[PDB]
Amino acid sequence: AKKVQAYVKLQVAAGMANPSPPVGPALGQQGVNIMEFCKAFNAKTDSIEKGLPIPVVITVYADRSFTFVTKTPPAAVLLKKAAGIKSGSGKPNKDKVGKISRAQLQEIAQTKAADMTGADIEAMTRSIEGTARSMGLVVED
Amino acid sequence: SITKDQIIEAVAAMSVMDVVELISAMEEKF
């Protein structure tokens, strides 16, 4: 690694790659084409499923296109498919909204293997211990 | 332990026996 050369992260869902209405002319402008950011993305995105957040770095030089290497997704968006309601925050901690305990989201703290600055396989559980409290979801743990 | 002039002089094992003491000197491995 080095530091910073060129990279960002703006996206709404994997259910629909390279969105046209959303970001539009706001998905790379320094060596990033808009009709090419769907030939290197769905090259492995269609290898798991479509409908979940997929951020990623953007290694840029000066040779026509570019190169990227994404990783584990956010454990906050997984609360629309693996937890409860469709939304999230909205109603923070003013009235016990959804409720997730020790059991749920358990293995969701097991998906980020290499991407988890929580050496202690057990302690790394305290990290995501909040990726489901940004709206108030008491744990029945 | 420290059995000096023996664990060495056991070289009477000759070639093929040394590959026998190496095949297993890891066997069930990579």
Binding site: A114, T117, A119, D120 | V11, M14, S15, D18, L22
Partner: protein, 163 residues
């Protein structure tokens, strides 16, 4: 913070990693980056862990003066900026390499490896440790004795001696 009640703390608490210390390394880190904690702490993921600490405590007056647990020849071993490192579990091998094969790649000065405890001496790195659990180094270590050490010379009179 806190005075003596806190000073004494950083001492004994970490100086336990000296009495019952596996290995030992003293590396300054002038110009260190965060990757400094994204390395010795990253390699702690799938090949190490919370079994390693490099608590920069070169407070000398605290670190050095704080080593009554027999570590002589150290009244010198504690110069300027420092960042001691110690082990509790595991062997006393590898570790030296995490530094030797990192700082060698720029990564700030490496105190030229001033050496630390265990044998208790001075400066001039070694590496007869990380060769451990690499048993196959003890395998070919026999150089097939009869074989190889033969097929390398006793049969070099043909590919290098027929003129």
């Amino acid at each position: 913070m806190a005075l003596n009640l806190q000073d004494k703390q950083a001492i004994v608490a970490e100086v336990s990693e000296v009495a019952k210390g596996a290995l030992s390394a003293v590396v300054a880190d002038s110009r260190g980056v965060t990757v400094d904690k994204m390395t010795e702490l990253r390699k702690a993921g799938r090949e190490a862990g919370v079994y390693m600490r490099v608590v920069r405590n070169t407070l000398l007056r605290r670190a050095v003066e704080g080593t009554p647990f027999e570590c002589l020849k150290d009244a010198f071993v504690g110069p300027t900026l420092i960042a001691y490192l110690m082990e509790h579990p595991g062997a006393a091998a590898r570790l030296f390499k995490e530094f030797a094969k990192a700082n060698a790649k720029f990564e700030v000065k490496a105190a030229a490896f001033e050496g630390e405890l265990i044998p208790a001496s001075q400066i001039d790195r070694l590496a007869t440790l990380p060769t451990y659990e690499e048993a196959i180094a003890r395998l070919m270590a026999t150089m097939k004795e009869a074989s190889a050490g033969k097929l390398v010379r006793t049969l070099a009179a043909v590919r290098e001696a027929k003129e």
